[PDB]
């Protein structure tokens, strides 16, 4: 288990985000799963400090995720921090110290919620590294493609190797620098003082580059992304094409899995070994058995059975659950219905609050209209139309156009169709030409 | 607004292209929108000089978009060029100046029409440093990771940092130096001639890239989508795979939006605010309102109302026309239909040639044969069957599997339904065993 | 044609591939068409050598595809080696010899099984560099971002400039360095007895790259594939998307081709001339003739005619055969079913098991129920039910919603349907309100 000494970490989540361009905060903006406040505060959460606190803008919006849902969730209390008006990061910090009891003994480490690959290894290695020179100021730092530096190698100030923007304060040293504007400036002040000022480098650049547009965004969703379809191929997954496969956090694929080109795995996706996922497949939420076959599929808040077959063309819908072996061929909507083992809803078919026994058939060009109950080993026929509710008995029969509207006893065919008749002759007295030469 | 001064710009378009290997001639290969010749002549007309004149090859299959749809588009006249045999550059743009009147005093840009990433402000540039010099000949180049130089930083010669092959001479000394072949020539001897000769540099190379093949084609309709796509997201864009996101000219996108990947915007597409695009999309000329969902779906000259949900598996053919909170749900298609507001086409269902009213439901499995008419607050049955020319009043039903031929009148059910029948222990004697044990 | 001297060359297969975290054995993945250990052995084959050996570790489950349909498609017997105990890859190479007779004259070609992208230029470089300087060994070597070297640029050694694994051996030279354990010793035993030593540079890296994980496996996949791609862009291929766009080895594509992003062709897929491939398309195994269309298709071991219509939404199953200028429309599965030249299967159909004429017309949401057999110029109407078996005449035609079960006589109509009957004022007294007002 890893987690640090006395530490107090402050989320900086203060920030308008004008260059976003969205009515929605840049915070709780969402990428691979989780939002940027999400991602934060998770890995706080890893370590576990002793307080956390976050400050924010405009509050109201952002207080209902956060301590609400953020924090139930983890397990522990985080507090709220306000700011008054927006001056700078150094007034931010001060106000997250606000929410700290005066007396407070322990460091304290500042962190930005537009920093959405930041791990809890960083952080880690930040606090460790604060320990060990025992500096006032310790800050994380990485080079890229303002940190200033004199002639012979020292750290002095910060002129928008760079700067990342995460701290490291011992509260003593902080409390004293801002009672003499922005928070770069308190480094300078405890430089003057002759305070140790450490700089601790990550060879990992994309885990403190931090958001201020939408394509910065997109820049670290397929970065984050990129580390997680590679995880899985070095865990045993199959991965065709990495660029177009898109892998959420906590998303767990079996072994010896097979993933074709423009597949999205989303929220909480659970994939079995030896599974066969098609091209353009995108599932959320969706639990699928062992060497179970989804292809082509929409799914969203479903399960699938182990060995099961669903696709190409399949829609699912919240509330499915399909069982082992069982097939949803081509064409197929599911909505809130149970399918049973081995059973095979193949050619244009809509099941809306359904529940099917197993081993049963279903026939094609055949709807369930809108609780509707089908037994087993059941062979409905073609274009087969079911008005809720209609319970089916086990190996009961259906003919091909039934209207069905009651109740059908086990063993027993349900037939409404129309039998066929032939009028010879007609297309010559009806149609002038086309299709009448020759007949 | 941008404009040069007295300029005559000549566009060379009279390779045979051997190298793309095609029937359809090189220029006319379109990339992200428009093709090759329409992105340069579009880039001209932004500045509108007082000549503009294209040369040609095989001129009577290019001289069709020329001057019939281009030059009628933008507003403004242009001449057209025919090169009796090609020689080489030079002879090309000797050719160009044949339409231009003998006395005439302006200066001439010479282009080629390859080269679709050139836009005003490369050649808006070029005429200005043409202008500061008082140059004979003034040249685009940018670096590679072909001029030939001395030793003291001079320009010299060119010997297939590197040449575009973009031109701005003096009509004065263009005319004497094709007197006394290629085009790189007429510098050389400008140079002997102790003229002055001059090199406006190029940051960005993509600008001024040639297409010879395929390959050279995809490389430029890779580079140009990827500053669209880019340009969107910094105006208020959220987009999940700007790779796999194709965005065409002219295609506008509202605020806060999400296009998730594999989605390709073609024509002219108008998309709304606060509108999720789902994976796996394309469009084509469709006019999309605000905060409408369109997921999986494979639109041509269509429009969709605000808070309307289409899809997925939605197919749409040009004419379609849906109203506001409309929805076109799994396996649906619609050809030259006005759908009105409210109303819900959701599963398996085919819509051609017909026209709804407001707030209405088809059921599924139902289809348009082949003008139709429904009205408002009608809900229709599963398994409906409409033979044109069908009216339907206002608040009418339609039962389930119903076949209909005539009118139907405002608040009256239609059926044809033949109604169930069940036969008991017929399976017990029809079918030996399988589904019979046990019944 | 090319071919080199006397040469025997042996192949590598022995190692347990752990790393790669599969059931399945390392070299039998497959990759842009073919597996590892067969895009080894057909670059052998077509330089053709007097033997050809495989070393395997656990042999019975590779000496299936080996020697039984790789030696029989190649046209040459191929023998296989099995190692006693994973001692190295110098004892690799000594079981490799035990198939050799013991008075073997002719040089030993080493190479890996998990070597894909190694083509028959790069095996034929190296035996040729191998004859030049009469070398006792002839090793192949590349540049990346373990060759020892000395001071005076000389072969020395290996310490996991590179080592690539491919090695050329002289039989006199390699079986007294071998009596006196890794395969790297060889070659330092070699110069210690004053043997020449000889270093070939190949200045493609990718050629000669090894795959430990699926990581590399999937680096390579997407590295073969984007030589493909290009190469059919020289010949006279327009793709739009080559980052999305899987082409498998075989698998040609015809002259002034259109391939829109998130196409896969896969195993011996065959295009015509002038084709337009839609976006988000998987052929595997089909034959599409000139100038049709395949937009949003997925295909498997199927014939499409010459100008054929085919898609959007279409699932292709084995045995479908479309003719000339036929049209596959919009949600229609095909299931082992012949279709004739110019007939049009448009909206929400399934054939299964049938046979079309010529110029013929399927209904929308019909189903074909599980030989049927449709004549030609036949109209069948919308909702039509098909139970096998039943033989249609040609001309004839079919009701909207009929249910066929019987034969079919020549342009004769065919109706099951009922009659519309219409209730005026239903909803008034059935329901209380909702569309009731206003009627």
Redesign the interface.
């Known amino acids: 288990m890893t987690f640090p000494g006395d530490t107090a970490v402050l989320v900086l989540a203060a920030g308008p985000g004008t260059r976003?361009?969205?009515?929605?905060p840049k915070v709780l903006?969402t990428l691979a799963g989780r939002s940027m406040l999400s991602h934060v505060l998770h890995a706080i959460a890893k370590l576990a400090p002793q307080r956390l606190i976050v400050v924010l803008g405009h509050d109201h919006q952002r207080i209902a995720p956060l301590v609400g849902e953020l924090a139930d969730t983890l397990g522990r209390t985080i507090d709220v921090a306000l700011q008054d008006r927006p001056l700078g990061t150094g007034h931010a910090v001060l106000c997250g110290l606000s929410a700290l009891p005066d007396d407070y003994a322990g460091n304290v480490v500042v962190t930005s919620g537009d920093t959405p690959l930041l791990d809890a290894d960083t952080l880690a290695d930040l606090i460790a590294t604060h320990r060990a020179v025992s500096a006032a100021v310790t800050v994380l730092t990485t080079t890229l493609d303002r940190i200033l530096r004199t002639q012979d190698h020292e750290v002095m100030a910060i002129v928008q190797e760079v700067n990342a923007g995460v701290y490291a304060f011992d509260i003593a040293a902080l409390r004293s620098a801002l009672s003499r504007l922005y928070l770069t400036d308190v480094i300078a002040i405890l430089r003057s003082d002759g305070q140790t000022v450490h700089a601790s480098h990550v060879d990992d650049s994309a885990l403190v580059a931090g958001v201020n547009?939408?394509?910065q965004?997109?820049e670290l969703?397929?970065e984050l992304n990129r580390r997680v379809v590679?995880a899985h191929?070095?865990?045993?997954?199959?991965?065709?094409?990495?660029?177009?496969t898109?892998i959420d956090v906590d998303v767990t694929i079996g072994?010896?899995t097979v993933i074709?080109?423009?597949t999205?795995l989303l929220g909480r996706t659970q994939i079995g070994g030896?599974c066969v996922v098609?091209?353009?497949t995108?599932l959320t939420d969706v639990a699928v058995g062992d060497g179970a076959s989804v292809?082509?599929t929409?799914g969203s808040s479903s399960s699938i059975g182990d060995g099961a077959a669903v696709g190409?063309?399949t829609?699912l819908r919240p509330g499915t659950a399909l069982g082992a072996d069982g097939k949803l061929?081509?064409?197929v909507?599911v909505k809130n219905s149970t399918i049973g083992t081995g059973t095979k809803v193949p050619?244009?078919t809509?099941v809306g609050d359904a529940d099917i026994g197993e081993y049963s058939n279903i026939?094609?060009?055949?709807?369930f209209?809108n609780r509707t109950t089908v037994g087993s080993?059941?062979?409905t026929?073609?274009?087969t139309?079911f008005?809720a509710p209609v319970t089916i008995?086990?190996?009961?029969?259906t003919g091909?156009?039934?209207?069905?509207?009651?109740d059908?006893?086990?063993?027993?065919?349900?037939?409404?169709?129309?039998?066929?008749?032939?009028?010879?002759?007609?297309?010559?007295r009806?149609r002038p030409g086309?299709?009448?030469?020759?007949?």
């Open positions: 976003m361009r969205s009515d929605t903006h547009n939408r394509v965004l997109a969703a397929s590679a191929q070095l865990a045993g997954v199959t991965v065709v094409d990495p660029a177009t898109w072994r010896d074709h080109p423009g999205q030896r098609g091209p353009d995108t292809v082509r929409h190409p063309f829609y061929g081509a064409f909507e050619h244009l809509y026939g094609a060009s055949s709807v209209v080993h059941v062979r026929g073609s274009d139309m008005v008995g086990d190996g009961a029969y091909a156009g039934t209207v069905v509207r009651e059908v006893p086990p063993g027993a065919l349900a037939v409404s169709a129309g039998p066929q008749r032939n009028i010879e002759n007609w297309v010559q009806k086309s299709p009448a030469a020759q007949a």
